[PDB]
Design a binder for this molecule. Structure first.
Ligand SMILES: O=C(/C=C/c1ccc[n+]([C@@H]2O[C@H](CO)[C@@H](O)[C@H]2O)c1)NCCCCC1CCN(C(=O)c2ccccc2)CC1
Ligand SMILES: O=C(/C=C/c1ccc[n+]([C@@H]2O[C@H](CO)[C@@H](O)[C@H]2O)c1)NCCCCC1CCN(C(=O)c2ccccc2)CC1
Lengths: 463, 463
């Protein structure tokens, strides 16, 4: 597209504020003290934006002329950009050290770094700060999404004895809830790192093009109804659609919006009586998944379940929690976020309902309403070479610590007792902990190391 | 970009759920009952995505094998999709009416509608409910942004006497707080509808290529300093940079972050003493912008000012509010949102400072941190022709009776008192409120009406 304008405008200017005789600026990324993040997504932005030849006689021309109308002034580093076109044929001379994608590393720890390879390109490092920082996203989607799984995991386990079907308990509805198209895709791929069910198709295009999966396919879905494929039959024909949709999909599992008009009549009257037969006559492989989109995730699940307990044969597992007949289940697809999720399963089990009769779906809570601040994703410079000798750097606002930056050449190590540790001031060169863990993944325009979305899983997974 | 996969998965199933003999699926967009939104963005989505020839022998085949391993079955409409290609040369056939881009309409009114073009593609209307709904974004950024302008407008006028400098008092710093690249593009462009300052160049591209400006500066910015261009000088050389930066950009406004280390020493001794002479010796056409970025956003602006008032020559004015010298101002970018913003100017007023000294900068809150939930952006079906007569549709839960739905064909009119009103039940037809303010903007694959970002701005203009 144009890296020359994939940066925060005021940077086009930074190349003239660095102390003079500076040959190296080394920057690092992190999630400043959710206490362990899933580092996923850097490998996308790299291939799709940095790798390869990225500077051209034409882009240097587009940039200025633009960063000219913009600034009402010629400040753009047109000189130092051709250096890059003339010498490395438009390949950025920067090294990028990161952690294996999917890695679940605690907070305040180094995840990736950026330093320039050529002393004439000292200005480049931070130029790419921006584009590279938008990882706070794939990461937060993944992290926050993975935290809901633990919640799901421990409630299923305690209420059922196992994790059967865990990976299909949170369904991403995000697509219409996101801002871009390019984004719905990136975020859908940050759920699949954890679950397999997704309606955002764009999510997979990404996976198999930037990460690759050897498996059958990264995500899936089933046929369901929406509000129009039901209200289009008429006010007084909810039952006609209900029925026309579960003979069509007699076939496989099928989800049907049951809250067009009162979702207790649809449950009791229509499913528990009229149509009670086009259902018990279904298979455990093709359940009739029921879908409320009402008011109050908790209050509703509990009641709908109460309606269904009364209209169908309820059983009870070796744990004491009630279960529905294998051909009937429920999904909360509206009003579900990490905070409310916990509320539901906890209420479900005080009532004694296997966390299994119910799966969920989250919209924008899952794909939008995520911020860089949620995890303090930050990108700062920790080391610079001025006149040949290096000096550790950082910031320390008085009106606020925690903003305090790490100093010098950082290293990410594995403590003899389990976790990690980021070593500062180049102290990692004394093999006390042995073997930095961040790998080079980018060096002078080429992607020196990628991971398949299969490893990404493995890495970011619950034990 | 294939649009056969720019829809929710389950929607692919949808063509088998409508009441048989359905020929018309007419749907509308709205912001169910921030209380008068700015309608912006449709013209992009509806042009970079739905426009021209969008279906093909291949796109039909690609979306085929995918909606196959995705669904573990073929229920994709390879039949119906080949109509649109073999019949209209891959031109999505649908008619979409909208309101003048930039239009500021109260809530609960129809903003746009979509109804298939031909009896065959009745299913199409909704298919695109997705693509067409990720517009809530361009709208809310524009809406949120616009409000903040009123808050700035009201305190400027009250404290300075005029609206001099409004268009430049809220600077977009979002670029790195947004999900993807395409997001900051779409988003920044939505801030400009309201203001003019942006660090996000990506946004401009979108404007010229999709709306066009006759203006020279659709977006504008000045050279600033970030945390590395200052710390690289060294813990004890914060000041050589301050002065290396106020000399490099001696004849243009320039902003210099001052919270690297204690942002009061910077203001007090460093700017007020050590480098004070490079300051009073600057034109008003290019002042020094001091930029805090840490601490309580209000307590800080107030002390920073109290600190500068003590170092520099402060005047008073016709309204009785104090102003500092022409060559010195403040930019407050950080912890700034619509809520916080107001806490700053009212607090600045009781202390008597004048919104002219200060200008703000928002990043995440400005571009990210917006939800489809504010404004309750919802796209629903209200009319459908089944078996020749067509019925007025709508949903009406009983858990959220706010989630009702309009019935029949809608129309937007202007009331004799001066506001708007959506007439439903095809009722706007008893012509008697004037004409539908909704123009046709898409009929059969071609864009029948675009607007220049100049009209847009002007519609969303204030008061
Ligand atoms: O329900 C949907 C999609 C709903 C949808 C899709 C797109 C958009 N929307 C709506 O957008 C909004 C965003 O705010 C909502 O109101 C959201 O639901 C709704 N797809 C079918 C998902 C079910 C796939 C099942 C396959 C197998 N499966 C089960 O057999 C199961 C097992 C145990 C418990 C529950 C289910 C678990 C999941
Ligand atoms: O300060 C910046 C850019 C800051 C920036 C840019 C990109 C990213 N960031 C960082 O994003 C993060 C999110 O937390 C932050 O740490 C943030 O500081 C900060 N550019 C200089 C802006 C000067 C704009 C002025 C031009 C002219 N102007 C004035 O002369 C003026 C008039 C009255 C009052 C004040 C100023 C009004 C606006």
């Amino acid at each position: 597209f144009n890296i020359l304008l994939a940066t925060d405008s005021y940077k086009v200017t930074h190349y003239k504020q660095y102390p003079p005789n500076t040959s190296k600026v080394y920057s690092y990324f992190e999630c400043r003290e959710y206490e362990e993040t899933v580092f996923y997504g850097l490998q996308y932005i790299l291939n799709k934006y940095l790798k390869g030849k990225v500077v051209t006689k034409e882009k240097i021309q587009e940039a200025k002329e633009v960063y000219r109308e913009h600034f009402q002034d010629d400040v753009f580093n047109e000189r130092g950009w051709n250096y890059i076109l003339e010498k490395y044929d438009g390949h950025l001379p920067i090294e990028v050290k990161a952690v294996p994608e999917g890695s679940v590393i605690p907070r305040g720890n180094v995840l990736f770094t950026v330093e320039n390879t050529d002393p004439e390109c000292y200005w480049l490092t931070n130029w790419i700060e921006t584009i590279l920082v938008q990882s706070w996203y794939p990461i937060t989607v993944a992290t926050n999404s993975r935290e809901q799984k633990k919640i799901l995991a421990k409630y299923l386990l305690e209420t059922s004895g196992n994790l059967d079907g865990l990976e299909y308990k949170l369904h991403d509805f995000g697509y219409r809830g996101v801002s871009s198209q390019e984004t719905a895709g990136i975020g859908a791929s940050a759920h699949l790192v954890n679950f397999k069910g997704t309606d955002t198709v764009a999510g997979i295009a990404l996976i198999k093009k930037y990460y690759g999966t050897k498996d059958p396919v990264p995500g899936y879905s089933v046929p369901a109804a929406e509000h129009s494929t039901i209200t289009a039959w008429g006010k007084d024909h909810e039952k006609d659609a209900f029925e026309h949709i579960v003979t069509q999909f007699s076939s496989v599992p099928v989800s049907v919006v049951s809250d067009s008009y009162d979702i207790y009549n649809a449950c009791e009257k229509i499913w528990g009586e009229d149509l009670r037969h086009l259902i018990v006559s279904r298979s455990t492989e093709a359940p009739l998944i029921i879908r409320p989109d009402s008011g109050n995730p908790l209050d509703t699940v509990l009641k709908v379940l109460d309606i269904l307990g009364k209209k169908f044969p309820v059983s009870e597992n070796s744990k004491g929690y009630k279960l529905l007949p294998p051909y009937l289940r429920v999904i909360q697809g509206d009003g579900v976020d990490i905070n409310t999720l916990q509320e539901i399963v906890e209420g479900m089990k005080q009532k004694k309902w296997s966390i299994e009769n119910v799966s969920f779906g989250s919209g924008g809570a899952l794909l939008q309403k995520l911020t860089r601040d949620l995890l303090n994703c930050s990108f700062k410079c920790s080391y610079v070479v001025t006149n040949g000798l290096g000096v550790n750097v950082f910031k320390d606002p008085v009106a606020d610590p925690n903003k305090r930056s790490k100093k010098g050449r950082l290293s990410l190590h594995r403590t003899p007792a389990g976790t990690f540790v980021t070593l500062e001031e180049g102290k990692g060169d004394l093999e006390e902990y042995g073997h930095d863990l961040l790998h080079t993944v980018f060096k002078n325009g080429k992607v020196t190391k990628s991971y398949s979305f299969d490893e990404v899983r493995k890495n970011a997974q619950l034990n």
